[PDB]
Design a protein around this ligand. Structure first.
Ligand SMILES: *C(=O)/C=C/c1ccc(O)cc1
Ligand SMILES: *C(=O)/C=C/c1ccc(O)cc1
Lengths: 376, 375
């Protein structure tokens, strides 16, 4: 009896930012309207990001009250931290409540809680905060993950799988709450690594309920977690780096990131699917972390995927941007929704087997083999 | 077939600080000798700590190079972080190598890696760094925990247990690498509790190998992980807090901590031991996180433990101080060593069942029921 995802709930900050209007917003609020040459470079990044809109906690009012966040490098961690700790908990609570509702069982039956946040370090953490906010059992077994990054959607499922399968009746609530107020900063002519994140990164929280041996009279399976793997891509040292500085979280990505990830996908697919006797990558439903448009294009190209395979993945990048660890769950959620709307036989686009990919710092690739559930 | 601890390896920085000489050292290097009343308060915290020595990465030389670390509240996260990331990695590597040696199997057989660090947030983390430093399988399944605190020794065992028991042949390397460069700071007259961190916190790394179904022809079981639990102590909100600020990791400890923990231990013991039909707390071997002597004295008194029950726990506090999540493993290591030396039948002082306690932010209590192995 495999660990099964039986509920998905999502949340995003109320402030919607249309990408077509973002280069004008970003340069105005950071008082960088005089940098014409750097504005054309950001317009190029935003138009080629394949993102239509993002939901961010940062507003014009927040940047006016805190001018140290509007600059590139300034001593601003304390003011970012205060908003980040409160924001991850608030967004996480909303996503959790939606997941708990779909699940259909009372929150008192949650035995384990896994919380994953890109940033927002606090002792006690977001896991404790969510236990209190959701009024969960004080004896809920918690796991708190700070600063893992974009691959963490796979990490939390990898963890939930072992918890659910080794503990009879265990019901795991996973909350991936990503907020980018920690990494929001002004542009600089001397730096070109941190400006890419201002165009691609979005905020969002996703929560899922995982459990083995579903009570089919009330619980409704969505996807089964068949196997999980984690690997470090060969010759990728220093490719995706993130440092929590006094100026907040700073991301440094090599231009080789899409090539390193894509050239390693066939190896991850082979290691995961050979014991299941599967070789056709187009026979699988795909949930891949959309780190950027280039990663998706190169994965499609090198693996030999048809245009419709990463359709849901691309749609989520288009509607929300890169929300780090939470993104794969928004894709997972939208996949079963679109599958139902298209009248398909399973939650995974009518297909039986599938794959979830998390990409991030290392370069780390999390490979989760999924099995869909039949839909009437 | 229960998840079993098959190896324990430990490491500490080379700089030894005798507690009897610490008040003078600390007040001199933080330029606080003029604060006579504050010195007395700190001197008493050190004398009542029941710590004889600690090993710290921080030196007088490092404080001279970085005066912003020596100050109570000065912008210093970046300089602390540079030393913290490198320090947790090298200390963790040393502990890991010792654990791998005792285990007896090649490092290529490690399928999972759990790393727990009080601080040193890095993307990629200490788990990645240790995978590279130890040249583990690039496909090692990693878990990285930053900023959990003092209960984490129980958390990592809780995780390792489920991993080992759900994955046939899984061999988990746990590395709890604790460095205080992130929180080492000068004293404050306004925040008297901050300096408790410099009176009690020591550096140290502990590594353990956990796996189910031991191959008895090579692997040697030390303790079995029977059951695990985690709970939040009632009415304990805000008692133990830590915030990662521009000045590094802050330390907040309210005076209610010993009473809150000690008045709740019997509930943790009852929840863990009633399904096993055990009610005599003295029939158990004890591995408790030594957050302070007051916690140990009050737990001994209210639970009704014999005076020498927490002997090993107190000895590790005496020899190394509070090394956060790594401490319980140093106690676990010393317990099996002392059991062997005292000619006792088991790794748990001759006793069958035992309990491991982790105490930290929340207040969170991690309760791990242990079973000893013959000597
Ligand atoms: C996830 O671990 C980080 C994703 C990301 C950060 C910064 C960028 O420029 C692009 C993607
Ligand atoms: C164990 O719970 C230690 C907690 C802690 C250590 C250091 C800090 O500055 C804050 C909390």
């Amino acid at each position: 009896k495999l660990a099964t995802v039986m509920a998905i709930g999502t949340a995003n900050p109320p402030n919607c930012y249309y990408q077509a209007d973002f280069p004008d917003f970003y340069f105005r609020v950071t008082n960088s309207d005089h940098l014409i040459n750097l504005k054309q470079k950001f317009k190029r990044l935003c138009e080629n990001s394949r993102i239509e809109k993002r939901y961010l906690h940062v507003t014009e009012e927040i940047l006016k009250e805190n001018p140290n966040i509007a600059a590139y490098e300034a001593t601003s961690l304390n003011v970012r931290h205060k908003m980040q700790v409160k924001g991850v908990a608030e967004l996480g609570k909303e996503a959790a409540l939606k997941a708990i509702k779909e699940w259909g069982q009372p929150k008192s039956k949650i035995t384990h809680l896994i919380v994953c946040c890109l940033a927002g370090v606090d002792m006690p953490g977001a896991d404790y905060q969510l236990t209190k906010l959701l009024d969960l059992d004080p004896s809920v077994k918690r796991f708190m993950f700070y600063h893992l990054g974009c691959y963490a959607g796979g990490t939390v499922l990898r963890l939930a799988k072992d918890i659910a399968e080794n503990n009879k009746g265990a019901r795991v609530l996973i909350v991936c709450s990503e907020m980018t107020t920690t990494c929001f900063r002004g542009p600089s002519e001397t730096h070109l690594d941190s400006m890419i994140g201002q165009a691609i990164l979005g905020d969002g929280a996703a929560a899922v309920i995982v459990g083995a041996d579903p009570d089919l009279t009330v619980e409704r399976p969505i996807f089964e977690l068949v196997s999980t793997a984690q690997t470090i891509v060969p010759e990728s040292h220093g490719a995706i780096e993130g440092h929590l500085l006094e100026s907040g979280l700073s991301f440094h990505l090599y231009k080789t990131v899409p090539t390193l990830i894509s050239n390693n996908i066939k190896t991850c697919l082979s290691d995961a699917f050979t014991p299941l006797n599967i070789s056709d990558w187009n026979s699988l439903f795909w949930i891949a972390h959309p780190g950027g448009p280039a990663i998706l294009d190169q994965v499609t190209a090198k693996v030999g995927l048809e245009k419709e395979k990463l359709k849901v993945t691309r749609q989520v990048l288009k509607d929300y941007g890169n929300m780090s660890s939470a993104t794969v769950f928004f894709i997972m959620d939208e996949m079963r929704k679109k599958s139902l709307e298209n009248g398909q036989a399973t939650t995974g686009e009518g297909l039986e087997w599938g794959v979830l990919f998390g990409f991030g710092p290392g370069i780390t690739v999390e490979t989760v083999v999924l099995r869909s559930v039949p839909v009437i």
